[PDB]
Design a protein around this ligand. Sequence first.
Ligand SMILES: *C(=O)c1nc2c(cc1CN1CCN(C)CC1=O)CCCN2C(=O)Nc1cc(NCCOC)c(C#N)cn1
Length: 277
Amino acid sequence: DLPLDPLWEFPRDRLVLGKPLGEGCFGQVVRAEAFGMDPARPDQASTVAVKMLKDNASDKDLADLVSEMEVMKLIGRHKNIINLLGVCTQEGPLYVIVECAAKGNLREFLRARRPPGPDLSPLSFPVLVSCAYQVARGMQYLESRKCIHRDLAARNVLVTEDNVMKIADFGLARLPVKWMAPEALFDRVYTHQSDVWSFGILLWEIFTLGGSPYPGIPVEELFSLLREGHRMDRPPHCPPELYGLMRECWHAAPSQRPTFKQLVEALDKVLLAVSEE
Ligand SMILES: *C(=O)c1nc2c(cc1CN1CCN(C)CC1=O)CCCN2C(=O)Nc1cc(NCCOC)c(C#N)cn1
């Protein structure tokens, strides 16, 4: 069984499950409608997402879902992360209610909003910087809460109906080798500074509108190329100020990379200037 948390327990009868959003190995995320999620308007319907176990799940999977739920409570609320909204622990399967991100992941959001490409030739430049800045803010918050993400990439950044960026799967208990810092790749060392390296890759994904990192380069060849000091080229139409930030994230020495605080500060300076360009 699971203890009743007066701060988070939501009534099971006020939650209506909908179509699945995605299925993992033993877990899944589904659409849902919640009634009275905001206590100020207790009859209002709101669209949410529900993390739950699949039928093939074991007690190890249940402990992993419980762990993510508890980590989400400990970390607390931020505008730029997928927030916990409530829980259904009593008289039925465990439901972890979280914020809905109607527009899906950032990579597909950007790919669907691309201008005519090189085989032929919507999102303004300030909106793109705002996306980067929002993700930097969310990461700054997670870091302040002792949370190392380990898998920061555009596929793990979700977009709401209101176009707010929300980092997902921060509470979790082929490998994404192209986003990994070299000390993480080679020495299995994951710090806040290795998340800064991934943020640099994410910045490149933003300014290529969902481009695949290291275009052409075989995965096997990546490691040797990084060891030689090679890094990705400046995306087309990307300003040198933003490419400069990417290159700082990609410094070999973790201590030579910027902090999330400096990234938030540098991205806010660009955003405020570019908003009147
Ligand atoms: C949220 O309930 C929601 N999410 C996604 C879609 C639709 C909806 C709800 N919804 C709003 C718009 N109207 C017209 C109908 C409707 O049903 C559409 C597809 C993309 N959604 C999505 O990605 N949601 C989402 C995903 C999450 N995880 C990403 C990995 O999924 C396995 C999370 C989380 N955590 C939260 N929302």
